[PDB]
């Protein structure tokens, strides 16, 4: 950066950094389910008397 403050000013900054990280997690689950269903056969589909 450059600028004016009681005359000319300039500054040049460099930078570097190194970070590390580690973590855990635990996840449960639970559930239920239902189902219904039919079937039919066209041709021989009903008996009589």
């Amino acid at each position: 950066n450059v600028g004016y403050q009681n005359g000319f000013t300039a500054n040049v900054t460099t930078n570097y950094s190194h970070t590390t990280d580690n973590s855990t997690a635990v996840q449960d689950s639970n559930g239920e389910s239902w189902n219904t269903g039919l079937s039919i056969n066209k041709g021989e589909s009903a008996y009589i008397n």
Partner: protein, 49 residues
């Protein structure tokens, strides 16, 4: 003050002691781009004898 054969001075050199430069907007720039010209004009000097 720089005698005949020497190099001229400068204005608003950027140092410890300085001053902000003189700005122009667009219409005065076009007025300078026309046939008008810039006047240097001295108010009052201060000297010795």
């Amino acid at each position: 003050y720089p005698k005949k054969g020497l190099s001229p001075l400068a204005l608003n050199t950027m140092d410890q002691f300085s001053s902000r430069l003189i700005p122009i907007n667009y219409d005065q720039l076009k007025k300078l781009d026309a046939g008008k010209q810039i006047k240097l004009e001295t108010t009052q000097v201060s000297g010795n004898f």
